[PDB]
Each structure stands twice: as C-alpha cells, then as structure tokens.
Amino acid sequence: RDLICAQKFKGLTVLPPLLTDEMIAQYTSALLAGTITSGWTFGAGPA
Amino acid sequence: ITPGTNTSNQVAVLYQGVNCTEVNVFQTR
C-alpha cells in the first residue's frame, strides 16, 4: 500500500489544486506565443 | 457550496474523497 493512501487513513488528506497541470501548461503557451510574436507589448496593453 | 443566502437557499454538497458510491451526481477529481 502506498504512503498516500496510508496517510489518508489517519486524517491527512491532500486537496487537489484548482489549476491542473494541463491548465497551467496552457498559460505558459500563451506567454511563449506572446513573447515570440508580440515581444513585450502583450503585457503592457494589446498584442 | 452556497451561492448566497440573499440570492437563494439551494446548496450543493461536495463529499471530498469519495467515488459517488460510498456516500445531480458528477464525480470530479
């Protein structure tokens, strides 16, 4: 038995994050797309 | 999950750490 389920049986339950790994990776793709194509204007107004 | 007493009185219940079997119904992560 893994330690995750072992610690859960004593009240130590881990809450899942709001932003998943897929949603965080999509935020990084928007930053890269804005940095390569727009430069520094996508953070100080329109792209 | 309460949208506010001034708005309505309907509430949703989220049982953290269950698979909708050992408790609309929608199983989340």
Coordinates of N, CA and C in Angstrom, one line a residue:
Chain A
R1 N 0.8 -1.2 0.0 CA 0.0 0.0 0.0 C 0.9 1.3 0.0
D2 N 0.5 2.2 -0.9 CA 1.3 3.4 -1.0 C 1.1 4.3 0.3
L3 N 2.1 5.2 0.4 CA 2.0 6.1 1.6 C 0.9 7.2 1.5
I4 N 0.5 7.5 0.2 CA -0.6 8.4 0.1 C -1.9 8.0 0.7
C5 N -2.3 6.7 0.4 CA -3.5 6.2 1.0 C -3.2 5.8 2.4
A6 N -2.0 5.5 2.8 CA -1.7 5.2 4.2 C -1.9 6.5 5.1
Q7 N -1.4 7.6 4.7 CA -1.5 8.8 5.5 C -3.0 9.3 5.4
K8 N -3.7 9.0 4.4 CA -5.1 9.4 4.3 C -6.0 8.8 5.3
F9 N -5.7 7.6 5.7 CA -6.4 6.8 6.7 C -6.3 7.4 8.1
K10 N -5.4 8.4 8.3 CA -5.2 9.0 9.6 C -5.7 10.4 9.7
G11 N -6.4 10.9 8.7 CA -6.9 12.2 8.6 C -6.1 13.2 7.7
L12 N -5.0 12.7 7.2 CA -4.1 13.6 6.4 C -4.5 13.4 5.0
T13 N -5.5 14.2 4.5 CA -6.0 14.1 3.1 C -5.5 15.3 2.4
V14 N -5.0 15.1 1.2 CA -4.4 16.2 0.3 C -5.5 16.7 -0.6
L15 N -5.7 18.0 -0.6 CA -6.6 18.6 -1.5 C -6.0 18.9 -2.9
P16 N -6.8 18.6 -4.0 CA -6.2 18.8 -5.3 C -6.2 20.3 -5.6
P17 N -5.2 20.7 -6.4 CA -5.1 22.1 -6.8 C -6.2 22.5 -7.7
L18 N -6.5 23.8 -7.8 CA -7.5 24.4 -8.7 C -7.0 24.3 -10.1
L19 N -5.9 24.9 -10.4 CA -5.3 24.9 -11.7 C -4.6 23.6 -11.9
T20 N -5.1 22.8 -12.9 CA -4.4 21.5 -13.2 C -3.2 21.7 -14.0
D21 N -2.4 20.6 -14.1 CA -1.2 20.7 -14.9 C -1.5 21.0 -16.4
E22 N -2.6 20.6 -16.9 CA -3.0 21.0 -18.2 C -3.3 22.4 -18.4
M23 N -4.0 23.0 -17.4 CA -4.4 24.4 -17.5 C -3.2 25.3 -17.2
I24 N -2.2 24.9 -16.4 CA -1.0 25.7 -16.2 C -0.2 25.7 -17.4
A25 N -0.1 24.5 -18.1 CA 0.7 24.4 -19.3 C 0.1 25.3 -20.4
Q26 N -1.2 25.5 -20.4 CA -1.8 26.4 -21.4 C -1.5 27.9 -21.1
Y27 N -1.4 28.2 -19.9 CA -0.9 29.6 -19.5 C 0.5 29.9 -20.0
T28 N 1.4 28.9 -19.9 CA 2.7 29.0 -20.3 C 2.8 29.1 -21.8
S29 N 1.9 28.4 -22.6 CA 1.9 28.5 -24.0 C 1.5 29.9 -24.5
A30 N 0.5 30.5 -23.7 CA 0.1 31.9 -24.1 C 1.3 32.9 -23.9
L31 N 2.0 32.7 -22.8 CA 3.2 33.6 -22.5 C 4.2 33.4 -23.6
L32 N 4.5 32.2 -24.0 CA 5.5 32.0 -25.1 C 5.0 32.5 -26.4
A33 N 3.8 32.3 -26.7 CA 3.2 32.8 -28.0 C 3.2 34.3 -28.0
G34 N 3.0 35.0 -26.9 CA 3.0 36.4 -26.8 C 4.4 37.0 -26.8
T35 N 5.4 36.3 -26.3 CA 6.8 36.8 -26.2 C 7.4 36.7 -27.6
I36 N 7.2 35.6 -28.3 CA 7.9 35.3 -29.6 C 7.2 36.2 -30.7
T37 N 5.9 36.3 -30.7 CA 5.2 37.0 -31.7 C 5.1 38.5 -31.5
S38 N 4.7 38.9 -30.2 CA 4.5 40.3 -29.9 C 5.6 40.9 -29.2
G39 N 6.4 40.2 -28.3 CA 7.5 40.8 -27.6 C 7.2 41.1 -26.2
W40 N 7.2 42.4 -25.9 CA 6.9 42.9 -24.6 C 5.6 43.8 -24.6
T41 N 4.8 43.8 -25.7 CA 3.6 44.5 -25.7 C 2.4 43.8 -25.2
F42 N 2.4 42.5 -25.1 CA 1.3 41.7 -24.7 C 1.1 41.8 -23.2
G43 N 2.0 42.5 -22.4 CA 1.8 42.6 -21.0 C 1.6 44.0 -20.6
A44 N 1.7 45.0 -21.5 CA 1.5 46.4 -21.3 C 0.5 47.0 -22.2
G45 N -0.6 46.2 -22.5 CA -1.6 46.6 -23.4 C -1.9 45.5 -24.4
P46 N -2.3 45.9 -25.6 CA -2.7 45.0 -26.6 C -1.4 44.4 -27.3
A47 N -1.6 43.2 -27.9 CA -0.5 42.5 -28.5 C -0.3 43.1 -29.9
Chain B
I1 N -21.5 24.2 -1.0 CA -21.4 25.3 -2.0 C -22.7 26.1 -1.9
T2 N -22.6 27.3 -1.4 CA -23.7 28.2 -1.2 C -23.5 29.5 -2.1
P3 N -24.5 29.8 -3.0 CA -24.4 31.0 -3.8 C -24.7 32.3 -3.0
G4 N -25.1 32.2 -1.8 CA -25.5 33.4 -1.0 C -26.9 33.3 -0.5
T5 N -27.1 33.5 0.8 CA -28.5 33.5 1.3 C -29.4 34.5 0.7
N6 N -28.9 35.7 0.4 CA -29.7 36.7 -0.2 C -30.2 36.3 -1.6
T7 N -29.4 35.5 -2.3 CA -29.7 35.1 -3.6 C -30.8 33.9 -3.6
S8 N -30.4 32.8 -2.9 CA -31.3 31.7 -2.9 C -30.9 30.9 -1.7
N9 N -31.6 29.7 -1.5 CA -31.3 28.8 -0.4 C -30.8 27.4 -0.9
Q10 N -30.8 27.2 -2.2 CA -30.3 25.9 -2.7 C -28.8 25.8 -2.5
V11 N -28.3 24.7 -2.0 CA -26.9 24.4 -1.7 C -26.5 23.1 -2.3
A12 N -25.2 23.0 -2.7 CA -24.6 21.8 -3.2 C -23.6 21.2 -2.2
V13 N -23.6 19.9 -2.2 CA -22.7 19.2 -1.2 C -21.6 18.5 -2.0
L14 N -20.4 18.7 -1.5 CA -19.2 18.0 -2.1 C -18.6 17.1 -1.1
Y15 N -18.6 15.8 -1.3 CA -18.0 14.9 -0.4 C -16.6 14.6 -0.9
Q16 N -15.6 15.3 -0.3 CA -14.2 15.2 -0.7 C -13.7 13.8 -0.3
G17 N -13.2 13.1 -1.3 CA -12.6 11.8 -1.1 C -13.6 10.6 -1.2
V18 N -14.4 10.6 -2.2 CA -15.4 9.5 -2.5 C -15.6 9.4 -4.0
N19 N -16.1 8.2 -4.4 CA -16.3 7.9 -5.8 C -17.8 7.8 -6.2
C20 N -18.6 8.6 -5.5 CA -20.1 8.6 -5.7 C -20.7 7.3 -5.5
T21 N -20.0 6.4 -4.7 CA -20.6 5.1 -4.5 C -20.7 4.8 -3.0
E22 N -19.8 5.4 -2.2 CA -19.7 5.2 -0.8 C -20.3 6.4 0.0
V23 N -21.2 7.2 -0.6 CA -21.8 8.3 0.0 C -22.7 7.9 1.2
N24 N -28.4 16.1 -8.8 CA -27.5 15.6 -9.8 C -26.2 15.0 -9.2
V25 N -25.6 14.1 -9.9 CA -24.4 13.4 -9.4 C -23.3 13.6 -10.5
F26 N -22.1 14.1 -10.1 CA -21.0 14.2 -11.0 C -19.7 14.0 -10.2
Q27 N -18.9 13.0 -10.6 CA -17.7 12.7 -9.9 C -16.6 13.5 -10.5
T28 N -16.0 14.3 -9.6 CA -14.8 15.1 -10.0 C -13.5 14.5 -9.5
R29 N -12.4 15.2 -9.6 CA -11.1 14.7 -9.1 C -11.0 15.0 -7.6

